């Protein structure tokens, strides 16, 4: 749950010379004292209980363990890691609304992928390198990177489709009946068709982008399920 995580750090005290048959450890109080405590600023103290543990199987073991339950104050990282990451992620969908004639789809999607990977590696440098659980922020960034790679592949496909002319490719009848008649209707496009083959190729490439813009908006919006669960 980084950066909204809560840590449970313990301090175990023992006498490394005498066992329970020689000295018995007792707790002066059930909690640690905060009478002269200086507030941290990054970490919020929640509870500092102390417990005296015996081993029913050993009878020579005694210790006192203090559980330090601390809660991270999350504004620093919510400002320096989450907002920049959400800002980067919001650009993952623009590539499908960018006209293919601008010749900048690759720049946009490649830059988005670069930024997401950089943020993922930074998060991998802030957290312990343990393989027990993955931060939800890291998982969400990982999912977004996979989506952006998929969008790069789709943009390459759409650019190939767009730069098609009747002198190099022939459009099959099924392509016509699907992409110029049926699919545009579902997406509320309604080709003006005021009147030539080259523009048909351009429109087909535009229909494919509009279709994937829908898919990347529902999935991206549904991506809040993988993000809103952290806070």
């Amino acid at each position, epitope marked *: 749950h980084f950066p909204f995580d809560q840590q449970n750090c313990t301090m175990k005290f023992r006498s490394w010379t005498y066992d329970r048959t020689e000295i018995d450890l007792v707790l002066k109080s059930e*909690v640690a004292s905060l*009478d002269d*405590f200086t*507030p941290s600023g990054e970490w*919020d*103290i929640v*509870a500092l209980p102390g417990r005296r543990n015996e081993n029913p199987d050993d009878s020579t073991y005694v210790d006192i363990t203090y559980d330090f*339950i601390i809660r991270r104050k999350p504004l620093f990282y919510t400002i320096n890691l989450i907002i920049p990451c959400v800002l980067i992620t919001s650009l993952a969908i623009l590539v499908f609304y960018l006209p293919s004639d601008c010749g900048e789809k690759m720049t946009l999607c490649i830059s988005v992928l670069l930024a997401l990977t950089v943020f993922l590696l930074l998060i991998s440098k802030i957290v312990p390198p343990t393989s027990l659980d993955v931060p939800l922020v890291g998982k969400y960034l990982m999912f977004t990177m996979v989506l952006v790679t998929f969008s790069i592949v789709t943009s390459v496909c759409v650019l190939n489709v767009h730069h098609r002319s009747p002198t190099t490719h022939t459009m099959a009848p099924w392509v016509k009946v699907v992409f110029l008649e049926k699919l545009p209707a579902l997406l509320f496009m309604q080709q003006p068709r005021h009147h030539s083959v080259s523009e048909d190729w351009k429109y087909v490439a535009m229909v494919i982008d509009r279709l994937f813009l829908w898919i990347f908006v529902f999935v991206c919006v549904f991506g809040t399920i993988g993000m809103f669960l952290q806070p």
Partner: antibody, heavy 118, light 113 residues
């Protein structure tokens, strides 16, 4: 262990009152102090909490801004200050000792009654 | 804030009868430690509340064994094997899992005759 609350209070509308909860017989600075409001009608509403050792404080959404917690360590006392007392604020307020995830609200103050009237 | 609801608002049950109290949460109040923190408080008229059960099932020291608790992610119930005169009062469910911590609606208890 004992939580001692201040006496009953009567205040005019729009004023501010400050009630206190004094804890003794335990590590006062290591236990959260929970403040609970009980209108004469019905219901228990938790106002918020303060850890005297530090300054950390939480408030329920309904009471954000209405109440403010301050704690004194030299004298084992915790204070809640209510601002802009209306007629709804008239109720009985309790102070309780709480350690999250380990010990429940096992000790409660006697209860302080606040009445808002002109 | 997690919203906690109690049913019934009033529970009339004569002496010696089984008493069932149900509390529900607007969200799951489970916690990573393997425990979900739920507590039950009883208030007599003109008195400060008293702790009865904590951590769903664990029973506070010095309380009659008739009281028992049980529940899951978002549904919990309190059981009283036998009802007595001292048992009269109001019962609240308290969740100690998600900040801020909220009380239940309260369920008054009465004896029918």
């Amino acid at each position: 262990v004992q939580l001692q609350q201040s006496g009953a209070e009567v205040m005019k509308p729009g004023a501010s009152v400050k009630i206190s909860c004094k804890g003794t017989g335990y590590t006062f600075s290591s236990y959260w102090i929970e403040w609970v409001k009980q209108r004469p009608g019905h219901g228990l509403e938790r106002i918020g909490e303060i850890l005297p050792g530090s300054g950390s404080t939480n408030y329920n959404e309904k009471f954000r801004g209405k109440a403010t917690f301050t704690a004194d360590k030299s004298s084992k006392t915790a204070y809640m200050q209510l601002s802009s007392l209306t007629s709804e604020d008239s109720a009985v307020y309790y102070c309780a000792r709480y350690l999250p995830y380990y010990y429940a609200m096992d000790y409660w103050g006697q209860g302080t009654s606040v009445t808002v009237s002109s | 804030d997690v919203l906690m609801t109690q049913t019934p608002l009033s529970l009339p049950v004569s002496l010696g009868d089984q008493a069932s109290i149900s509390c529900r949460s607007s969200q799951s109040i489970v916690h990573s430690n393997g425990n979900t923190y739920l507590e039950w408080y009883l208030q007599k008229p003109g008195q400060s509340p008293k702790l009865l059960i904590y951590k769903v099932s664990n029973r506070f020291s010095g309380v009659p064994d008739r009281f028992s608790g049980s529940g899951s992610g978002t549904d919990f119930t309190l059981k009283i094997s036998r009802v007595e005169a001292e048992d009269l009062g109001v019962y609240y469910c308290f969740q100690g899992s998600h900040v801020p911590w909220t009380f239940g609606g309260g369920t008054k208890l009465e004896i029918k005759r």
